Amino acid sequence: YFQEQPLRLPSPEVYRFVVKDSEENIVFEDNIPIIKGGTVVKLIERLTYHMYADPNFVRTFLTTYRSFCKPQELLSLLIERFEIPEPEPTDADSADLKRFRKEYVQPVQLRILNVFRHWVEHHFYDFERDLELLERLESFISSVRGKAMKKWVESIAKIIRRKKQAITFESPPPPIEWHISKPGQFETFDLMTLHPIEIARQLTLLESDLYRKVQPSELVGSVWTKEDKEINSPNLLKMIRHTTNLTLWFEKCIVEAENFEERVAVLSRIIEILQVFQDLNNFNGVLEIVSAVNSVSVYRLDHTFEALQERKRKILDEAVELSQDHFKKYLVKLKSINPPCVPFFGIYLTNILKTEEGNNDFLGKDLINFSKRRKVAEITGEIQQYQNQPYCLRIEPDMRRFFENLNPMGSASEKEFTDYLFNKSLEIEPRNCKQPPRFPRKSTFSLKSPGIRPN
Numbered sequence: 001y002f003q004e005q006p007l008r009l010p011s012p013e014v015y016r017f018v019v020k021d022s023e024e025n026i027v028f029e030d031n032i033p034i035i036k037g038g039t040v041v042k043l044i045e046r047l048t049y050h051m052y053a054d055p056n057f058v059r060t061f062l063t064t065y066r067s068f069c070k071p072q073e074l075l076s077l078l079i080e081r082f083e084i085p086e087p088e089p090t091d092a093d094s095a096d097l098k099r100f101r102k103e104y105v106q107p108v109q110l111r112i113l114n115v116f117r118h119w120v121e122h123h124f125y126d127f128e129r130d131l132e133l134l135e136r137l138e139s140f141i142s143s144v145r146g147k148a149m150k151k152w153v154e155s156i157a158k159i160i161r162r163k164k165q166a167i168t169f170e171s172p173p174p175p176i177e178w179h180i181s182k183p184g185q186f187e188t189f190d191l192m193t194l195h196p197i198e199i200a201r202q203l204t205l206l207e208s209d210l211y212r213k214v215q216p217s218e219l220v221g222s223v224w225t226k227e228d229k230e231i232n233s234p235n236l237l238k239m240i241r242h243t244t245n246l247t248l249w250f251e252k253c254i255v256e257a258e259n260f261e262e263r264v265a266v267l268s269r270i271i272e273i274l275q276v277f278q279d280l281n282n283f284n285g286v287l288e289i290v291s292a293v294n295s296v297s298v299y300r301l302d303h304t305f306e307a308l309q310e311r312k313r314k315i316l317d318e319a320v321e322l323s324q325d326h327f328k329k330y331l332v333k334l335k336s337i338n339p340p341c342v343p344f345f346g347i348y349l350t351n352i353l354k355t356e357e358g359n360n361d362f363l364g365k366d367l368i369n370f371s372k373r374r375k376v377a378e379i380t381g382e383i384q385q386y387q388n389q390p391y392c393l394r395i396e397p398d399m400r401r402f403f404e405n406l407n408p409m410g411s412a413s414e415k416e417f418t419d420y421l422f423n424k425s426l427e428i429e430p431r432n433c434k435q436p437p438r439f440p441r442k443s444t445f446s447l448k449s450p451g452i453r454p455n
C-alpha cells in the first residue's frame, strides 16, 4: 500500500545477479510467487532472494537442478552470489550503504548458507561422486568471515562430518525356513532346494532395500536413460537390473525343466512364492513373476498351465489381473494395503518418462523450464513422502548373495538368450502336440513342496 525508497545496488556489470527482471530472463506463473522459468542466473537469484525465504523452491531446485545445471556450476554460481560488491560511492561522496548491508548483503549471504546446508543434508551424494566439489565448498566455507554466519558455517561442517562417517526389530522376527539345501552350502542353492517362504522373504528384503535407496534425482530428467546413467542413477539401475535378472530367472527355471511333471512342480512352486509375495505386499515380486509367465516362451506352455491345481491357477490369474487395464487393479490395491510394502517402480518411471517427453526443457534467449522440473519433482515427491515401514524379517546372508549374483543369461546376450529359451520351449512342448513329450527327470531330489505355512 506504499512504495518505499528502492535499495542502492551495485551495477549489473559488476554483479550480474542484479540485472533487471524481464520476460527474456525470468518468467513467473499467474497462480510468494511461483517461478515458471528463467536463466540459471535468475534461478539462483530467486533461490537466494533477499526479500523472502522460499523453502519449497529450495527443496525443488536442489532435487531437480542436475537436469539443467552441473553441480560444479551450481557451486560457482552460489559463491559468485555470495561475493557481493558494494555500490560505488555517490557522486557527492552511508545511509544507503548501511541499508544495503542490512537489507541485501546479510539476507542473501544467509540464504546461500541455507542452500549449502540443505545441499549437504539432503543430497550429499553429489559430494561423494565429486570430491573436488566438496573441497571447494569446504575451502569457501572456511574463508567465510562473520560472527552472524559462524553458526551457519559450523552447522554446515557439522553435517559434513556426519555424512563423512557413514538389524533391530520391533517384534521378534519369525525363524528362517530351510528345505533341502541347509545353511552354508550355497553351491546347492536353487529354486526347488530352498524353501518357498524364505525365497519370498529374502527377495522381499532385498527388493525393499533396493527400492529404499532410490532418490528422486535419479529419476529427474530421465538421467537413468542418458549418457551419465551409471553415475547419476546407480540405485535405480540396480533396482531395474535386479528385476530384469529375477524375471529371466523365473522364466529359465520353468523352460529348462524338460520333464513335464517337474515343470508343473516348478511353476507351482513359483506360484507359492508369488503367494507369499502377496502376503508381504511385495508388488515388485508379484509383477516379476507375472512378467515371467507372460514371456512368450512360458506363456505358450498350455499343457503346463492346464495341469496346475485350480487353486494355484486362480492365484496366478488374480495376480495377472493386477496389471490389466493400465494397472487399474494394482493402483487401488496399493492404496488400500498398509506398510511394510514394496511398490512397483515401473509405473512411476513411465509417469515420469511421459511428462518428460510432453513438457519442453525450455520455455530472446531460451529460458530453463522450471515448471517441468516442479511437475517431475511432484511425481517423485509422492514416492518419497509415502510412510513405509521396514520388514520384520531376518536377513539370511547366503541366500541374499545367491539372489544378488543370479546370472540366468550365462554367457549369452539378450537376444541370444531369448532365442535359446524359445527353442527350448518348442522342444518341451511342440506346436500342436496332443500331450507333452516325456523327458528324463534331472533332479535327484523330490519336488514335493513344504507348503507356505511357517513354524
Ligand SMILES: NCCNc1ccc(C(F)(F)F)cc1[N+](=O)[O-]
Residues within 6 Å of the ligand: 211, 212, 213, 214, 215, 216, 217, 219, 236, 239, 344, 345, 346, 348, 349, 380, 381, 383, 384
Ligand atoms: N527413497 C525411497 C523412496 N523413493 C523412491 C523409491 C523408488 C523409486 C522408483 F523410481 F524406483 F520407483 C523412486 C523414488 N523416488 O524417486 O523418490
